[PDB]
Amino acid sequence: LSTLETSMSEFGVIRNYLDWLTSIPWGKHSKEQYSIPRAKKILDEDHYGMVDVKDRILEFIAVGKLLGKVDGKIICFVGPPGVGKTSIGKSIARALNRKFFRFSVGGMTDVAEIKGHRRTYIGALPGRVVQALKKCQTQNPLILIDEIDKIGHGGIHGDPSAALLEVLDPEQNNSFLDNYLDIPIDLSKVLFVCTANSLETIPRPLLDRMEVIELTGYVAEDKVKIAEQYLVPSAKKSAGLENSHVDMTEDAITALMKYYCRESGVRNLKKHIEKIYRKAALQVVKKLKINVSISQKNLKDYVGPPVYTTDRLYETTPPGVVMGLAWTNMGGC
Amino acid sequence: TYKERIKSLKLPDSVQKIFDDEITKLSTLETSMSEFGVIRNYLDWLTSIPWGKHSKEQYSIPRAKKILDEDHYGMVDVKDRILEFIAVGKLLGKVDGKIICFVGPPGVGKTSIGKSIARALNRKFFRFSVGGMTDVAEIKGHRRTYIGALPGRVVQALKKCQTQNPLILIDEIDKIGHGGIHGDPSAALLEVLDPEQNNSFLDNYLDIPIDLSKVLFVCTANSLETIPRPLLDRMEVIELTGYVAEDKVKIAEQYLVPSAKKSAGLENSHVDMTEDAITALMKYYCRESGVRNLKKHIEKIYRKAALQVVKKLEKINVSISQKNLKDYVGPPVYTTDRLYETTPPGVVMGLAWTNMGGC
Numbered sequence: 001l002s003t004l005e006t007s008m009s010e011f012g013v014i015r016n017y018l019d020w021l022t023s024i025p026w027g028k029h030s031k032e033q034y035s036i037p038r039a040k041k042i043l044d045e046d047h048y049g050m051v052d053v054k055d056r057i058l059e060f061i062a063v064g065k066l067l068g069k070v071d072g073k074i075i076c077f078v079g080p081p082g083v084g085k086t087s088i089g090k091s092i093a094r095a096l097n098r099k100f101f102r103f104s105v106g107g108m109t110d111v112a113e114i115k116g117h118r119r120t121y122i123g124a125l126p127g128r129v130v131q132a133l134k135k136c137q138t139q140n141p142l143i144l145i146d147e148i149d150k151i152g153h154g155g156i157h158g159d160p161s162a163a164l165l166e167v168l169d170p171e172q173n174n175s176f177l178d179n180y181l182d183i184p185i186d187l188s189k190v191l192f193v194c195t196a197n198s199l200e201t202i203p204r205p206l207l208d209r210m211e212v213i214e215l216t217g218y219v220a221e222d223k224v225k226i227a228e229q230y231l232v233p234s235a236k237k238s239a240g241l242e243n244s245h246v247d248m249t250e251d252a253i254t255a256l257m258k259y260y261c262r263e264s265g266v267r268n269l270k271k272h273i274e275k276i277y278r279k280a281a282l283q284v285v286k287k288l289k290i291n292v293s294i295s296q297k298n299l300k301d302y303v304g305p306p307v308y309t310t311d312r313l314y315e316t317t318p319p320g321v322v323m324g325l326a327w328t329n330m331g332g333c
Numbered sequence: 334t335y336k337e338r339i340k341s342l343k344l345p346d347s348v349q350k351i352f353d354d355e356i357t358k359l360s361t362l363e364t365s366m367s368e369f370g371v372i373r374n375y376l377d378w379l380t381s382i383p384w385g386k387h388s389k390e391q392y393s394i395p396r397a398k399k400i401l402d403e404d405h406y407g408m409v410d411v412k413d414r415i416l417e418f419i420a421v422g423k424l425l426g427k428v429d430g431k432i433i434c435f436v437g438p439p440g441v442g443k444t445s446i447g448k449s450i451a452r453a454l455n456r457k458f459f460r461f462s463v464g465g466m467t468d469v470a471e472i473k474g475h476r477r478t479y480i481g482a483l484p485g486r487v488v489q490a491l492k493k494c495q496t497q498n499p500l501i502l503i504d505e506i507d508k509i510g511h512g513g514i515h516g517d518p519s520a521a522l523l524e525v526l527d528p529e530q531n532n533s534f535l536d537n538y539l540d541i542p543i544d545l546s547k548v549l550f551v552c553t554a555n556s557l558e559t560i561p562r563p564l565l566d567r568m569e570v571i572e573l574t575g576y577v578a579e580d581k582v583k584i585a586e587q588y589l590v591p592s593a594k595k596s597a598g599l600e601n602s603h604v605d606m607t608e609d610a611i612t613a614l615m616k617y618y619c620r621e622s623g624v625r626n627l628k629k630h631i632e633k634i635y636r637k638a639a640l641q642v643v644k645k646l647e648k649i650n651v652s653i654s655q656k657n658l659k660d661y662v663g664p665p666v667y668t669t670d671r672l673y674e675t676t677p678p679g680v681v682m683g684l685a686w687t688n689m690g691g692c
């Protein structure tokens with residue numbers, strides 16, 4: 001560049017390359033946390049009972065405390081929808097004192113979004129991993145691959161699944177070898193987190209490189225605990241409704257579990273609580289005492305009189321009938 | 334050229350730094366090569382987005398209710414939902430973009446209610462019809478390296494509205510082409526329609542993320558068994574039950590007859606249609622749940638009336654009553670005559686449900 005002029009495009013190519021090289025955090029790392037109780041606390045103030053993930057993070061901190069190298073593994077989360085397999089990422093990064101970056105891979109089907117293009121092209125840019133490293137301005141970040149199952153296994157003009165498998169190599173990760181940044185880059189410190197629903201879609205070579213943690217859904221008791229601890233206060237706050245007035249009783253939440261929400265996630269529960277407090281806010285606006293009571297006896301006025309209870313059940317079994325069990329998405333049957 | 338907008342839109346900090354770096358790059362660039370052209374296009378796309386301007390949120394319940402009720406009759410659920418949305422927005426001073434889906438038989442009015450909702454909420458309306466996509470390019474866009482690189486239709490919709498917090502009406506969700514390899518727009522919609530990921534849309538053409546947490550996404554589908562469970566989990570579905578015969582008659586007499594008469598050239602001048610004619614047309618011609626074929630029948634009747642008025646050039650007003658209805662809309666086609674006057678042994682009358690309705 002010292003012998004280049006702005007007249008020809010060589011100067012532009014070289015300055016773009018230099019800017020990309022100097023933007024990448026080549027040597028600076030993040031300050032790892034060494035306080036296990038502090039990390040446990042900061043993990044327990046956002047989610048209720050995801051015991052396996054919290055134990056994994058605590059073990060990560062403990063093993064990092066016994067060395068000076070912060071090794072980044074490939075943790076992978078699989079579970080039913082609405083179990084918080086994506087919302088944890090931010091809290092996990094906060095607990096690990098790392099910078100969080102989310103990388104959605106839902107519709108991406110070209111390797112140019114992973115490896116980029118050569119400098120020969122007019123508008124070539126590096127992949128999203130290098131851009132994530134540039135945005136974080138630090139090594140060992142927390143890159144959350146938001147959709148592993150929904151890639152399509154590649155069609156034509158690119159096979160992104162193979163490129164991602166090249167990125168997520170537990171041993172040969174120190175040389176990513178970006179196509180645009182044409183020299184190897186150390187990805188062995190980055191922490192990679194999945195967000196997946198079905199394990200039968202990921203190819204076996206890619207699945208073999210990832211440590212999978214099964215994120216089982218929530219039981220009805222865990223559902224009411226999650227509601228009363230995080231969802232009811234948040235839904236109440238998201239519509240004003242602050243000063244010592246309308247709230248949902250415990251029997252109302254129990255009836256909501258028993259008759260309206262039998263799934264594994266807590267998203268439909270969020271919808272029901274949001275609609276209850278939305279109707280309460282509408283009533284408050286229309287009426288301009290200020291206390292409104294919501295309980296079991298008046299719950300089928302807010303979430304709708306329709307319910308979800310049949311229980312099937314013969315009062316007394318005649319000879320020939322036998323009651324077995326079956327597994328369904330809506331709890332059991 | 335680009336300074337006035339970026340001054341007047343109050344863009345976030347990260348995009349401000351990106352824009353500053355971009356103009357620093359352009360200062361050393363010249364028109365001779367295509368680098369200047371692609372940079373200018375990138376800056377034009379970046380400046381087009383209404384980064385920090387919103388609309389005036391609705392604050393009056395009665396006027397919003399009257400705006401809603403002047404174009405549709407029976408959607409009490411949708412009107413109640415909009416009223417609750419306004420009430421919630423009033424108590425906070427801010428607004429949140431909720432995701433809502435409409436499901437029902439064709440003709441109930443899922444697509445038309447979107448414009449009325451947007452007008453009541455004082456939000457600019459954009460309708461995105463996505464029935465025929467096979468690729469994600471229309472949702473996430475293409476990288477600027479490619480010559481045929483255009484942002485996703487969400488970014489283009491935000492530019493067209495020229496104001497954030499719009500109402501984006503997604504016309505079809507059932508017709509979404511799932512296909513296989515070469516693209517899957519369903520997961521792209523999952524990314525777009527995530528209630529907590531709206532802050533990091535991260536379009537391909539614009540590497541900087543954009544905020545979609547204020548957009549009021551309104552979807553529309555006919556069935557619910559085709560949509561993937563992850564997509565359906567993040568959507569709030571409202572069922573639209575088909576109209577009853579009395580409801581259809583009221584909808585006709587209050588909105589369809591005046592509109593068809595106005596658009597047929599006989600507006601409030603000569604021709605009227607009796608209630609008995611409406612009831613007969615409902616019972617013998619239009620037994621469905623929607624009001625599309627009923628509207629077609631009324632428009633045909635009024636077109637024939639206009640032709641008769643023009644050619645003819647008795648009574649002062651022309652009546653289209655039940656007795657002379659068959660000479661305007663043809664013979665009845667849905668007569669019920671397969672019944673039994675006296676049921677013989679072995680025969681039992683049952684009931685059935687179809688898309689048309691009861692049987």
Ligand SMILES: Nc1ncnc2c1ncn2[C@@H]1O[C@H](COP(=O)(O)OP(=O)(O)OP(=O)(O)O)[C@@H](O)[C@H]1O
Nearest residue numbers: 047048049080081082083084085086087226266563
């Ligand atoms: N165990 C939990 N404790 C507290 N909140 C939870 C828990 N699981 C989920 N939530 C809450 O439920 C909501 C939805 O969670 P989220 O968006 O992370 O779902 P998900 O499991 O990642 O979804 P999907 O599989 O569809 O991608 C969030 O508000 C999240 O905080």
Ligand SMILES: Nc1ncnc2c1ncn2[C@@H]1O[C@H](COP(=O)(O)OP(=O)(O)OP(=O)(O)O)[C@@H](O)[C@H]1O
Nearest residue numbers: 404405406407439440441442443444445584588624
């Ligand atoms: N309640 C109503 N009041 C007045 N007009 C109505 C009402 N419901 C439906 N219509 C009219 O009936 C027609 C239905 O068209 P519209 O596109 O709104 O239906 P849709 O159910 O959304 O259609 P599709 O499923 O084919 O997309 C329109 O002309 C609309 O104005």
Ligand SMILES: [Mg+2]
Nearest residue numbers: 588591592593
């Ligand atoms: Mg009209």
